């Protein structure tokens, strides 16, 4: 765990079966179209996979089609300029700052805001080390509120 | 050199425990460290029970009890003999 304590080994473990499940008679000629429709209707890939798993019974998009969901979402040009986790961290930091500008006495909120901003900077450095973010991306704390886009 | 494993108190997973005040001397003592005796006593001794229960009415009147719940600092508890010094090995026995 990056900050605080607690190992928290809670996670999801993929099955040994790396292939598409035998019982799935459905065809991958339209799974990508389904996720494309979901993304257009407006859904982040993290929860696109979840609604695909629950409401469509097609787990492991990587097994149904040989490609991962964010990859094919990019291949259709859908993917947003700011990735999942960076955007979620930005949103959380924005909410914290909005709370703080009203409650100046929330020292605990200030500490958590510093922690989440540190996480934002670490993740941003990684994502712009990859070409997944323009080299001038900075996360100005003044402009982050509208930066969500 | 670390007389007791628990340091003479019962604090774990905690940083600060609010103090109470000794019932005898009034000294501030952390609540987790104080010697606490819940004292449930008769109002009066057995002879005065016998006399009141005949001088009363209702012919079945039951004398109310007294719930005191004292808490003492280590010095006051030792002086009042609520706790003994105890030998090194018996020091680990708690019940």
């Amino acid at each position: 765990r990056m900050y605080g304590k607690g190992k928290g080994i809670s996670s999801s473990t993929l099955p040994y079966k790396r292939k598409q499940p035998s019982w799935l008679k459905q065809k991958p000629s339209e799974i990508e179209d389904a996720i494309i429709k979901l993304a257009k209707k407006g859904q982040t890939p993290s929860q696109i996979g979840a609604t695909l798993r629950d409401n469509y019974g097609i787990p492991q998009v990587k097994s149904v089609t040989g490609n991962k969901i964010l990859r094919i979402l990019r291949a259709q040009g859908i993917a947003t300029t700011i990735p999942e986790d960076l955007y979620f961290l930005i949103k959380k930091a924005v909410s914290m700052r909005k709370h703080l500008e009203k409650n100046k006495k929330d020292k605990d909120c200030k500490f958590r805001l510093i922690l989440t901003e540190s996480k934002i900077h670490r993740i941003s450095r990684y994502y712009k080390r990859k070409k997944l973010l323009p080299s001038n991306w900075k996360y100005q704390s003044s402009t982050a509120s509208a930066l969500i886009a | 050199p670390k007389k007791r494993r628990n340091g003479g108190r019962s604090k774990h997973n905690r940083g600060h425990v609010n103090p109470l005040r000794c019932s005898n001397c009034g000294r501030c003592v952390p609540k987790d460290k104080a010697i606490k005796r819940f004292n449930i006593r008769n109002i009066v001794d057995t002879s005065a029970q016998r006399d009141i229960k005949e001088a009363s009415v209702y012919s079945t009147f039951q004398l109310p009890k007294l719930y005191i719940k004292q808490c003492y600092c280590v010095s006051c508890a030792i002086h009042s003999r609520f706790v003994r010094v105890r030998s090194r090995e018996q020091r680990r026995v708690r019940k």
Partner: protein, 127 residues
Amino acid sequence: ELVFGVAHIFASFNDTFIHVTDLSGRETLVRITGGMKVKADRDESSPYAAMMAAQDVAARLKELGVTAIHIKLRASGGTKSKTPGPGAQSALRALARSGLKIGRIEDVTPIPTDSTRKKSGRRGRRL
């Protein structure tokens, strides 16, 4: 016929107030305490002082006509000490031997839900 008073007994490691009033608490009939019984500037909390305080409060109640008593016990206060003082024992003892009838007994010592700071420092009394 059985006429009732309320005897507020106050025992506080010093003199023992025996204070008999009517039912409402107002309109006090007789208060004796323990100071007027012993003239030693001390022993005011003694069971002997409380017994002598009670065995004349009984005579005055007998004269006043009151024949039964509701005992109402009090131990100093919310910040000083919760246990009734030494004289409480002999107070009800002598009230019982006095011959007047006794009803309900209750401990009405003021117990603070708060924790107003008690006297002495955080190091307590050193004597």
